[PDB]
Every structure is written in structure tokens, then in C-alpha cells.
Amino acid sequence: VVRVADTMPSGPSNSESIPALTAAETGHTSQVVPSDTIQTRHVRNFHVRSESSVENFLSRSACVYIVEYKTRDDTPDKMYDSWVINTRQVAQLRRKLEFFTYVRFDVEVTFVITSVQDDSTRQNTDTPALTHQIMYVPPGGPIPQAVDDYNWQTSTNPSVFWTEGNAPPRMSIPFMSVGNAYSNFYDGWSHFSQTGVYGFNTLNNMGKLYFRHVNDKTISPITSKVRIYFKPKHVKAWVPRPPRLCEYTHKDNVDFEPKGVTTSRTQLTISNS
């Protein structure tokens, strides 16, 4: 229970104390309460800065990447589908996380899967319930190479089985950074000769996901689309920064084109027009 500050009463004054005059040339942000400019009354203000906390601002489920993969095709790479784990491919969740320089959050993942029946000659089938497998793979793990390859066995790796017709799956992920905070910004190279790649990409190292259909070769292909919703919680954030003005270009850098700082007025002085 923490309220905002109230308003103290004031009166007619003639003093050498000057709240209006300050030195903005020192970087000190002035602290003038409205009780020092005009004659403000007593206000018992009960506003609570509740829904502006760093926990409340970022703990909303946001999409990161759509994954599309069918259950039977002609090529083995259009069946299952993988994804390298990153939060920097959709500008909303990325732009909300790029207020800060370093953050420390646990991730709570929720998958939402929809199945679209493709068009063919024999669409009138009696199709049983589909099944989905989502195998997390740590950095350096084995590479699945087919829908029937024996690397999908999960002797150790985290996996989840879902059947269409239930609530969507949900699992939590603890803090997995090897440093102390997920670096949304890293100004440096990879090689110690100041060469290689420039990122922002040297410190991703999150691993990758994999998707496949557990069911066998069906007699009708079904386009599956799964949506990943990250939901951070227990959030601590440090050393903030202003948000991004220009639009994004890619995921592995910060590059852009220059944008005008705002939209023009075509006048400079307001009037009744």
C-alpha cells in the first residue's frame, strides 16, 4: 500500500525562495510541486501507481514466431519445422523489452496450435486426433533430420505432447543466462581482434526448438500452425534507455534507415484556427 503524494496548501508569498528558477545546466531534474506556483488547495489524492510497475508492464503474453509445417509432403524439410529461440523478430515484444539495457526474467511459454486441412482429391477422410511434439534442444544438441529419425526420443531433453481439443500447453523456463542478465544490448565483437560479427548476436546462445507430428503418414496433408507466447515474470530491470524511433530491419543487428523525428505541424503558433 503506497499512495502518490498529496497536495499541500499554499498562500500569498513574497520570498527570496525561488522554486521557479533552477539550474538545468547540471543535469538535475527540478522538483517543483504545484503547491509552489499558484495557490493550490488541500487534495487528498488516492492514486496508486499500481499498473505501471516493471512487473505489471511486461508480464503479458506476446507472440514471437509463427511456425508452419505439414503432416505429409514430398520433401522432408516441409514436414517438421524448427526455430532458433529469440525474442527479436516481432517489434511489439521487442520494443517493450528495449526500454532497458539488462533484464532478469523467467520465461513462461504457451503454445497455440491450429490445424488447417489442405485441398486435395480425397479430403473426405475420417481423421483421428492429431498429436504434437515440441522438443527443446540445448546449444550443441543432436540435429533432428526427419520425422522418423531416432533423435526425437528425448532421453534427456524437455518435450511436451499435446492432443487437439484441450487447453493449450504451458511450461515455465528459469533464468538461463550464463552471465547475470539477458543482454538486450551488447556493444562488441566476437573475435578478440575486434573482428567477426557485431552484435547483439554473439550473446544470444539460447538453443532452438523443434516441431513435428507424432502421427504417421496420413492420407491427407494438414497444414499445422503453432504460435509461441512468451510471458515473463519475476522481472528485475536495470539502467534504462529511450525507446526506438526508427523502424526495425533485421533480427541480428540494429540497422535502420533515418526517420523524421515526428510529424510536422505546418504552423508554429497556435490560435483559434
Partner: protein, 58 residues
């Protein structure tokens, strides 16, 4: 192993139930009742603090 705390309700007009189930801390719910703040390191980032009555680097 129960914990009782007040709900979030407005002024001038509770005591819910919370039981910690799973064997980790990454399963604990989001701590959405931290209202604490201190604008003392984004305003006043200074040595020789101002008074607001003195002429402030006279």
C-alpha cells in the same frame, strides 16, 4: 503451508489464499504487488544536493 494477504481494491470502498505447489521458484506466481519506488537515482543524480530554496548553483 498457506499464505494470506490482501487483495488489490480501491480507496474509500479480501484476504485471498495462496499455496505454493511446485518444487521450484520458477513456478511461483508473478509478484504483482511491488509498489515500491525511489526516483533518487534518475532525478538528483548529483553531489552537493540542491535545497530548492537556495539559488541552486548561484
Amino acid at each position: 503451508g498457506a499464505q494470506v494477504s490482501t487483495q488489490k481494491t480501491g480507496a474509500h470502498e479480501i484476504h485471498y489464499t495462496n499455496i505454493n505447489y511446485y518444487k521450484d521458484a520458477a513456478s511461483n506466481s508473478a509478484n504483482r504487488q511491488d509498489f515500491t519506488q525511489d526516483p533518487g537515482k534518475f532525478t538528483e543524480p548529483v553531489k552537493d544536493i540542491m535545497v530548492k530554496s537556495l539559488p541552486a548553483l548561484n
